[PDB]
Design a protein around this nucleic acid. Structure first.
Ligand code: AMP
Ligand code: AMP
Ligand code: AMP
Ligand code: AMP
Ligand code: MG
Ligand code: MG
Ligand code: MG
Ligand code: MG
Ligand code: MG
Ligand code: MG
Ligand code: MG
Ligand code: MG
Lengths: 289, 225, 289, 225
RNA sequence: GGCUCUUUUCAGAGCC
RNA sequence: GGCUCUUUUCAGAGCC
C-alpha cells in the first residue's frame, strides 16, 4: 500500500542521499563497513537501500516488540501475629516498588515507603521480628492513601501505561488479592483498576522451569537459580529486589513474563495464557467511597 | 558532622557544533539523573528525559553523531521547564533535602554553571536555588588522586581506576551511570566527596574544603523570570 | 500457526536436549557463553530456548537473499559474420551455464559445452577472433539438442524447479528471444517452456541503478560497479561468470532480481513489475516438431 | 607429463557413536563433492546430497550433534546407490577422465578406504574402480610441511596456514570447501598434489611418489555385487 | 536521455 | 506429583 508513515521518512532520506557528493558517499558507506568501490549512481542506490533496510527493519520489530517495557515489582509487608491467626485484620506496613526495565534488564527505580496502620496500630512482637520493621518506623509513617498516591506519582513520572507498556509482578497472589484488597476496604478506597491484574512469578516460575508449587518459595526459587538472598529476608524492599533478580534471570532465559492473575468481584482468578499480551492501564489515585 | 545520604549525578547533553565554538548558545537536549545511595553505594534511581530545544530546533550532523541523540527523539520530547519539573518531582518523591541530605554531582562544572545556567535564561526560568552548589567530580578526582586537569576526562578517569566505559559515550545516561561508578569507587577508596563548586552572582566559584558538610535545599520548581 | 516445519525441528531438538545430562548441559552451555549456574531443569530450559532463538532467527533470514533459490546464468555464443549482416542465420556454438546459489552467493555450478553448427558449419575469421572458439572445437562438439539435454541433465541434478525456485538470467534479451529462438527452429525443437521467461540483467541494472539503456552493456556495467573483466571477453562461460558477479553485487545492494521478460508466440514481451514473483518450471528436454 | 586438470574433494559424513568404537559399521549419510580447477584454483562445482542409511536408520544424538545432519534430512534422502549415481552423473557432465585428467582428494584415508569401502558392501555394490586411488591431503601436508601425522587434523592445517574454518565444522560440504582451501594454498605454495594412496585387494596401500602422474579412470556406476 | 504510472511526489516503480 | 489444552505430540502452553 506504501501509505505507511515510514515511507515518507525514507523519501526525505533518499533525497538526502541524492544530494550527497561522491566524496561523502565513499566516506559514509565505509563507516557502515559496506563495499565502497563503484560509480556515482551505484554508491547512491547502495546507501539508499541500507537506510531502507534499517528503517523498515527497526519499524518491523517496533510493532513486533509488543511485550511490556517495564515490570513493576511490589512486595507488601503487613501486620501479623505469631502463628498467623485466622481473623486478624491485616494492614499494609511497607509499600516497596522495584521498577524493572525489561529491555536493559536494569532496575531503574527502587522506592520504599512505610505505612501507618490505623486498626492494629501497635505492631506485634512476632511481626517486628519477622519484617524487621520497628514501631518507630510505622509511627512516623504516612497513611496508606498518601502512600499509594506517592507510588502512583512515581509511576506517572516514569510514564507507565501512557508511554510504556507495563505490568505489576509479585511473589504469590497474596500481595494484591489479600493485602491490597483488605487495605482498600479499610482505607475506604475503591480498588485501583491498575492493580486488578498482575504477574504471579510463582506460577510463572513453576510453568517455565517445571517445578511444583511447594518449590516456588522465594528462597528456593533463588537457590534453584544458583544464587543466594541479597539483603534482609522478609524486608519488603529487599524481597522485591530479589524477586527482581529472579525476573531478570527468567527474562534472560527467554521467559516472556505475562499477566496470569486478576481480581474480579473480590475473587482471585486465573488469566488465560493464550490471551494476547495486554498492558496495565495508566495508574490513577482511586477515589474514596 | 554527618555525610550526604544521597548523591545526585547529572550529566546534561546539549546542542552543539563541530569544533566547540566558545560563544555558542547551548540548549539542553538530554536530562539524565542517577541517584546514588551513599550508605549502600547503590544506584537507587535512574531517570533519563530528552529535551526539545526551542531556539536551535535542528540538531547538527556533528551533534547527532557525538551524542547519538536523533532528531526525532528531540521532536517528541518535552521542553526544558516540563523536563525540570519532572526531575524535581522525582527528587521530592525521594525526599531529597527534607528527609535525606543530598548533593548534586557533575563531571566537570559546565553542567550547572554553563548548560543549566544558559538553558534557564532561554526557558525564562530563574536559576533553581538548589542547583547553586555541586560536587565537581573532576575536581575531587584531581585532588584525591593528585592528577592534573588534563587527566580528568571521563574516559581517562575510568582507565586509571581499571574500568572500561559502559554503553555509549556522550549518551547522557550512560555518562551519568559511568560517573556514578567513579563516584562509588572514590567513596570506597576513602574520599568523602563534598561540594567543591558553587555559583554566586552568575559567577563560578570554589567551595572551601574546611567548610562543614552542608546539604542542598529541597528542590523547588523555579518561578518564571 | 505453529504449522510451520520449523516447529517440528524444535520439538526434535527439545527432546534431544531433554535427554542431556547436567554435565552435557553445563558443557554445551559454556560453549555458547550462556550462564552455567543453576539446576538440571533450569539449564535444560535455558539451552532449549537458545536453540529456539537460533532456529527462528535463522529461518527469518531474507536479506541479501532472493525469492529464487538459484539463478541460472546463460550467455550463448553464436556463429557470426563481420559487420553482423542482417540475414545471416545464427547458430549457438557455446552453451555456458553458471548456476548461482542466491543465499550463499557462491557459484555452485559452472558448465561449458561447445556446439557443432549444421547450417554454417564453417566458422568465420571474425567469429573465431571474437568468441575465441576454434574450428577444431565446434568440429569435435555435439549437436545442439544433445548439448541442451546435457544442460537440462545438470538442472535436474541440482533439483531446479522441483525442490528449488529458480530463473534464467541473461545479459540482454538476445540469448533467449533470438539465439535459442532461432536455434530451436533450426534444430526443429519446440521452444522449451522453462526458457520462456527470464531475468534481463540489463533491465534490472537499468532501473535499479537509474542508468540509461545505452550504458547497460556488459563491460560498462562492470566498470560502473568498480570491477574489471575476469577472463576473456566475448567468451560465453567467462561472460556468464562476470554476469554472475554483477548479479551478486546487485543482490547484496538489495535488488530483488525478478523475471522481467517473457516470450509469447515468438514475440518478445516484458513481464509486469507488479505481478507476483514467479519461478521457472522444472526443465524438460523439448521434443521434435 | 601433465598435471591433473581437476581435483574432486570428497568428505563423507557417516553414522557414528560417542567414543568412536573401532568395530562400528559406518554408513555414509552425506556425500559432498567439490570440483577444484587446478589451472585457475577456482571451485567450479559443489554438490551436496544427504544419504539415507538402511541399516542404522535412526541417527544417534551424538551424530546429530557432531555433523549437524538431522533425522529429517536423512529421511527425505535417497539411498547410497542413488546418491552415488547422481555424483557420477555430475562427474560425467564435467567430462572427468575423458576430456580432463582428474584425481580424488580426501582429508585422510578413511573416507575412501573405510566409509566408501564399507558402504558399498552394505549397498551391495562392487567397489567403483575410479575410487581406488586418491590424494590423502593429510599425507601430502605432512610430507610437504614436515609435520607429524598428529598435526594434520583439519583445524590445525588451516591454523598453520593463517585460516579460520569457513562454515559449520563437520558439515561434509563445509569440510570439503575448507579442504579445497588447503589444496589451493598447497598448490600455490608449490606442492603439486599427487595421488599417494590406493586400495588393492581391499587393503590400504601407499602409492609411490616415484610413479608417474596417472589419471583416475572415467567414473562409472559400479554394478551390483 | 525520451516517456508512463504511484500521497515513498525533495520520493518510488516501470516502459521503448 | 495430580490433571487439562495443543500436528512444537521423543514436544509445547497452562491449571489446582
Ligand atoms: N510465617 C508467617 N506468619 C505470619 N504472617 C506471615 C508469615 N510470613 C509472612 N507473613 C505475612 O505476609 C507479609 C509479607 O509476606 P512476604 O511478602 O511473603 O514476605 C508479612 O508482612 C506478614 O504479615
Ligand atoms: N567534542 C565536542 N565538541 C562540541 N561539543 C561538545 C564536545 N564534547 C561535548 N560537547 C558538548 O557538551 C555536552 C556534554 O558534554 P560531556 O558531558 O562532556 O559529554 C554535549 O551534549 C555537547 O553539547
Ligand atoms: N560485434 C558483433 N558482431 C557480430 N556478432 C556479434 C557481435 N557481438 C556479439 N555478436 C553475436 O552475439 C553472440 C554472443 O555475444 P554477446 O551477445 O555479446 O554475449 C556472439 O557469438 C555473436 O554471434
Ligand atoms: N569425534 C568423533 N567421534 C565419533 N565419530 C567421528 C568423530 N569424528 C569423526 N567421526 C566420524 O567420521 C565422519 C567424518 O568425519 P571427518 O573425519 O571429520 O570428515 C563423521 O561423520 C563421523 O561419523
Ligand atoms: Mg511476598
Ligand atoms: Mg516480603
Ligand atoms: Mg559532562
Ligand atoms: Mg556527556
Ligand atoms: Mg550476450
Ligand atoms: Mg557473450
Ligand atoms: Mg573427513
Ligand atoms: Mg567432515
Amino acid at each position: 500500500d506504501f501509505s505507511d508513515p515510514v515511507y515518507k521518512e525514507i523519501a526525505i532520506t533518499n533525497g538526502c542521499i541524492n544530494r550527497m557528493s561522491k566524496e561523502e558517499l565513499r566516506a559514509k558507506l565505509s563507516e557502515f563497513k559496506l563495499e565502497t568501490r563503484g560509480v556515482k549512481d551505484v554508491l547512491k542506490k547502495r546507501l539508499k537501500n541500507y537506510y531502507k533496510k534499517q528503517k523498515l527493519m527497526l519499524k518491523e520489530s517496533n510493532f513486533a516488540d509488543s511485550y511490556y517495557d517495564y515490570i513493576c515489582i511490589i512486595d507488601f509487608e503487613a501486620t501479623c501475629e505469631e502463628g498467623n491467626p485466622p481473623e486478624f485484620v491485616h494492614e499494609i506496613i511497607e509499600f516497596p516498588v522495584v521498577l524493572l526495565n525489561t529491555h536493559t534488564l536494569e532496575i531503574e527505580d527502587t522506592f520504599q515507603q512505610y505505612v501507618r496502620p490505623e486498626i492494629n496500630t501497635q505492631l506485634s512482637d512476632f511481626c517486628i521480628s519477622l519484617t524487621g520493621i520497628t514501631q518507630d518506623q510505622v509511627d512516623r509513617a504516612d497513611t496508606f492513601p498518601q502512600v499509594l498516591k506517592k507510588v502512583i506519582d512515581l509511576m506517572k513520572l516514569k510514564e507507565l501505561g501512557t508511554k510504556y507498556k507495563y505490568s505489576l509482578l509479585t511473589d504469590g497472589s497474596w500481595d494484591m488479592s489479600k493485602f491490597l484488597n483488605i487495605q482498600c476496604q479499610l482505607s475506604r478506597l475503591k480498588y485501583p483498576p491498575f492493580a486488578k491484574k498482575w504477574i504471579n512469578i510463582r506460577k510463572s516460575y513453576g510453568n517455565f522451569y517445571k517445578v511444583p508449587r511447594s518449590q516456588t518459595k522465594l528462597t528456593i526459587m533463588l537457590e534453584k537459580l544458583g544464587m543466594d538472598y541479597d539483603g534482609r529476608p522478609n524486608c519488603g524492599l529487599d524481597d522485591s529486589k530479589n524477586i527482581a533478580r529472579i525476573a531478570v534471570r527468567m527474562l534472560q532465559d527467554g521467559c516472556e513474563l505475562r499477566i496470569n492473575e486478576k481480581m474480579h468481584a473480590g475473587q482471585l482468578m486465573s488469566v488465560s495464557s493464550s490471551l494476547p499480551i495486554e498492558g496495565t492501564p495508566p495508574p490513577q489515585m482511586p477515589h474514596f467511597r | 558532622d554527618s555525610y550526604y545520604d544521597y548523591i545526585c549525578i547529572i550529566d546534561f547533553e546539549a546542542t552543539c557544533e563541530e569544533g566547540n565554538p566558545p560563544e555558542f548558545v547551548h540548549e539542553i537536549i538530554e536530562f539524565p539523573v542517577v541517584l546514588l545511595n551513599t550508605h549502600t553505594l547503590e544506584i537507587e534511581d535512574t531517570f533519563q528525559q530528552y529535551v526539545r530545544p526551542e531556539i536551535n530546533t535542528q540538531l547538527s550532523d556533528f551533534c547527532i553523531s557525538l551524542t547519538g541523540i536523533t532528531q526525532d527523539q528531540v521532536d517528541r520530547a518535552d521542553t526544558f521547564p516540563q523536563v525540570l519539573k519532572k526531575v524535581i518531582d522525582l527528587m521530592k518523591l525521594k525526599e531529597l533535602g527534607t528527609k535525606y541530605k543530598y548533593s548534586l554531582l557533575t563531571d566537570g562544572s559546565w553542567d550547572m554553571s554553563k548548560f543549566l545556567n544558559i538553558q534557564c535564561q532561554l526557558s525564562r526560568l530563574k536559576y533553581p536555588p538548589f542547583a547553586k552548589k555541586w560536587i565537581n567530580i573532576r575536581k575531587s578526582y584531581g585532588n584525591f588522586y593528585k592528577v592534573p586537569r588534563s587527566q580528568t576526562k571521563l574516559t581517562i578517569m575510568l582507565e586509571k581506576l581499571g574500568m572500561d566505559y559502559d554503553g555509549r559515550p556522550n549518551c547522557g545516561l550512560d555518562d551519568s551511570k559511568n560517573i556514578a561508578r567513579i563516584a562509588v569507587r572514590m567513596l570506597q577508596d576513602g574520599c568523602e566527596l563534598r561540594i567543591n563548586e558553587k555559583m554566586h552572582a552568575g559567577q563560578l566559584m570554589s567551595v572551601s574544603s574546611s567548610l562543614p558538610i552542608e546539604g542542598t535545599p529541597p528542590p523547588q520548581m523555579p518561578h518564571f523570570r
